[PDB]
Paper text:
High expression of PSMαs, which are four peptides of about 20-residues in length, increases virulence potential of methicillin-resistant S. aureus (MRSA). Amyloid aggregation plays roles in PSM activities in S. aureus. In the present study, we investigated the structure-function relationships of PSMαs and their short truncations.
We found that the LFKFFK segment from PSMα3, identified as fibril-forming by computational methods and which indeed forms fibrils, shows dose-dependent antibacterial activity against Gram-positive Micrococcus luteus and Staphylococcus hominis, but is nontoxic to S. aureus, the secreting bacterium. We obtained two atomic resolution structures of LFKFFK; both revealed a departure from cross-β fibrils and atypical amyloid architectures. One polymorph was fundamentally different from steric-zippers, displaying no dry interface between pairs of β-sheets. Instead, hexamers of β-sheets formed cylindrical channels running along the fibril-like structure, effectively yielding nanotubes. The hexameric configuration lacks the tight interdigitation of β-sheets characteristic of canonical cross-β fibrils, such as PSMα4-IIKVIK and eukaryotic steric-zipper amyloid segments, resulting in a smaller solvent-accessible surface area buried and lower shape complementarity at the interface between the β-sheets. Moreover, the cylindrical architecture of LFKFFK polymorph I is reminiscent of that displayed by a polymorph of amyloid-β fibrils, and a HET-s prion fragment. The FF motif is present in the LFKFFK segment, and the hexameric structure of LFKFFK resembles the FF nanotubes. This farther support the role of self-assembly in antibacterial activity and specifically the hexamric arrangement that forms channels along the fibril axis.
Numbering used by the authors:
A (entry chain A), B (entry chain A), C (entry chain A), D (entry chain A), E (entry chain A), F (entry chain A), ...: 1 to 6
The structure:
Amino acid sequence: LFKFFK
Amino acid sequence: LFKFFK
Amino acid sequence: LFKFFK
Amino acid sequence: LFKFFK
Amino acid sequence: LFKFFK
Amino acid sequence: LFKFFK
Amino acid sequence: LFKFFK
Amino acid sequence: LFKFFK
Amino acid sequence: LFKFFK
Amino acid sequence: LFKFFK
Amino acid sequence: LFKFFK
Amino acid sequence: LFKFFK
Amino acid sequence: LFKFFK
Amino acid sequence: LFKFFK
Amino acid sequence: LFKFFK
Amino acid sequence: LFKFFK
Amino acid sequence: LFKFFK
Amino acid sequence: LFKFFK
Amino acid sequence: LFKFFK
Amino acid sequence: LFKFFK
Amino acid sequence: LFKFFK
Amino acid sequence: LFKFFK
Amino acid sequence: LFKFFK
Amino acid sequence: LFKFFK
Amino acid sequence: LFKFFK
Amino acid sequence: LFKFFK
Amino acid sequence: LFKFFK
Amino acid sequence: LFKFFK
Amino acid sequence: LFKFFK
Amino acid sequence: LFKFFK
Amino acid sequence: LFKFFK
Amino acid sequence: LFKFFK
Amino acid sequence: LFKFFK
Amino acid sequence: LFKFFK
Amino acid sequence: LFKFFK
Amino acid sequence: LFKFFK
Amino acid sequence: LFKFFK
Amino acid sequence: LFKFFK
Amino acid sequence: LFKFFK
Amino acid sequence: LFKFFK
Amino acid sequence: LFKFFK
Amino acid sequence: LFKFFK
Amino acid sequence: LFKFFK
Amino acid sequence: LFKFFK
Amino acid sequence: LFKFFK
Amino acid sequence: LFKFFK
Amino acid sequence: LFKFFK
Amino acid sequence: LFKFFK
Amino acid sequence: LFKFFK
Amino acid sequence: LFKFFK
Amino acid sequence: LFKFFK
Amino acid sequence: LFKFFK
Amino acid sequence: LFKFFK
Amino acid sequence: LFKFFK
Ligand SMILES: [Cl-]
Ligand SMILES: [Cl-]
Ligand SMILES: [Cl-]
Ligand SMILES: [Cl-]
Ligand SMILES: [Cl-]
Ligand SMILES: [Cl-]
Ligand SMILES: [Cl-]
Ligand SMILES: [Cl-]
Ligand SMILES: [Cl-]
Ligand SMILES: [Cl-]
Ligand SMILES: [Cl-]
Ligand SMILES: [Cl-]
Ligand SMILES: [Cl-]
Ligand SMILES: [Cl-]
Ligand SMILES: [Cl-]
Ligand SMILES: [Cl-]
Ligand SMILES: [Cl-]
Ligand SMILES: [Cl-]
Ligand SMILES: [Cl-]
Ligand SMILES: [Cl-]
Ligand SMILES: [Cl-]
Ligand SMILES: [Cl-]
Ligand SMILES: [Cl-]
Ligand SMILES: [Cl-]
Ligand SMILES: [Cl-]
Ligand SMILES: [Cl-]
Ligand SMILES: [Cl-]
Ligand SMILES: [Cl-]
Ligand SMILES: [Cl-]
Ligand SMILES: [Cl-]
Ligand SMILES: [Cl-]
Ligand SMILES: [Cl-]
Ligand SMILES: [Cl-]
Ligand SMILES: [Cl-]
Ligand SMILES: [Cl-]
Ligand SMILES: [Cl-]
Ligand SMILES: [Cl-]
Ligand SMILES: [Cl-]
Ligand SMILES: [Cl-]
Ligand SMILES: [Cl-]
Ligand SMILES: [Cl-]
Ligand SMILES: [Cl-]
Ligand SMILES: [Cl-]
Ligand SMILES: [Cl-]
Ligand SMILES: [Cl-]
Ligand SMILES: [Cl-]
Ligand SMILES: [Cl-]
Ligand SMILES: [Cl-]
Ligand SMILES: [Cl-]
Ligand SMILES: [Cl-]
Ligand SMILES: [Cl-]
Ligand SMILES: [Cl-]
Ligand SMILES: [Cl-]
């Protein structure tokens, strides 16, 4: 799993 | 699964 | 499945 | 597990 | 385990 | 175990 | 065990 | 055991 | 045992 | 109820 | 009820 | 209830 | 209750 | 209760 | 109760 | 009770 | 009770 | 009771 | 009075 | 009075 | 009065 | 009066 | 009166 | 009156 | 009156 | 009156 | 009156 | 003079 | 003079 | 003169 | 003159 | 003149 | 003249 | 003139 | 003139 | 003139 | 030369 | 030359 | 030359 | 030359 | 030459 | 030459 | 030459 | 030459 | 030459 | 190949 | 290859 | 390779 | 290799 | 190799 | 090798 | 080798 | 070898 | 060898 948030 | 949101 | 929305 | 936050 | 905080 | 604090 | 404090 | 204090 | 105090 | 707006 | 507007 | 706003 | 704001 | 602020 | 501030 | 301040 | 100050 | 001061 | 424009 | 603009 | 701007 | 700014 | 700034 | 600054 | 400074 | 300085 | 200095 | 464009 | 742009 | 930009 | 920037 | 910077 | 810096 | 430094 | 240093 | 040193 | 696009 | 993009 | 970006 | 970045 | 960084 | 660092 | 360090 | 150290 | 030490 | 979409 | 997205 | 993201 | 992050 | 972090 | 930390 | 610590 | 401590 | 202590 990969999550990216900005 | 891939999701992209902006 | 592919969905694109703008 | 890797988490990065700034 | 490694944790870094600043 | 290693801990560093400043 | 090693501890350093200043 | 070694202790140093100043 | 060694102790030093000043 | 569901509402979506953009 | 369903409404769609664009 | 769920609300999302950006 | 959960609230998230950025 | 949990609150986080930065 | 736990509080952390920096 | 525990308090830490620096 | 324990207090430490420097 | 124990007190230490320097 | 109601006005709607898009 | 209510006004909404996006 | 309420105003919201983003 | 309440004002919030970020 | 309450003011908060960061 | 209370003021806090860091 | 109470003042604290570090 | 109480004053403390270090 | 009490004064302490070191 | 008034001009409006969208 | 007034100008508005988004 | 007033200017606002975001 | 007033200027505000963030 | 007043200037504030952070 | 007043200047404050931290 | 007053100057304070720490 | 007053000067204080520690 | 007064001078104090330790 | 002038070009405008939206 | 002038270019503007948003 | 002038360039502005946000 | 002038450059500004934040 | 002048450089400022924070 | 002048340099300032904190 | 002048140097200051703390 | 002048040097000061504490 | 002058030297002072304590 | 060139593609443009808005 | 060049890609641009906003 | 060059990548730019904001 | 050069990487810049803020 | 050069690394800079703040 | 050079390392600097504060 | 040179090391400096305060 | 040189060592200095205070 | 030289040693100095106070
Ligand atoms: Cl990515
Ligand atoms: Cl993509
Ligand atoms: Cl597509
Ligand atoms: Cl990373
Ligand atoms: Cl690291
Ligand atoms: Cl380390
Ligand atoms: Cl060490
Ligand atoms: Cl030692
Ligand atoms: Cl010894
Ligand atoms: Cl939907
Ligand atoms: Cl969602
Ligand atoms: Cl979330
Ligand atoms: Cl969290
Ligand atoms: Cl924690
Ligand atoms: Cl702790
Ligand atoms: Cl302790
Ligand atoms: Cl002890
Ligand atoms: Cl309608
Ligand atoms: Cl509405
Ligand atoms: Cl709202
Ligand atoms: Cl709010
Ligand atoms: Cl608050
Ligand atoms: Cl508080
Ligand atoms: Cl306190
Ligand atoms: Cl006290
Ligand atoms: Cl006492
Ligand atoms: Cl109109
Ligand atoms: Cl308007
Ligand atoms: Cl406005
Ligand atoms: Cl304002
Ligand atoms: Cl202010
Ligand atoms: Cl102030
Ligand atoms: Cl003061
Ligand atoms: Cl004083
Ligand atoms: Cl005195
Ligand atoms: Cl035009
Ligand atoms: Cl323009
Ligand atoms: Cl401009
Ligand atoms: Cl500027
Ligand atoms: Cl400046
Ligand atoms: Cl300066
Ligand atoms: Cl100085
Ligand atoms: Cl001096
Ligand atoms: Cl002297
Ligand atoms: Cl084109
Ligand atoms: Cl382009
Ligand atoms: Cl670029
Ligand atoms: Cl760069
Ligand atoms: Cl650099
Ligand atoms: Cl350096
Ligand atoms: Cl040095
Ligand atoms: Cl030396
Ligand atoms: Cl000597």
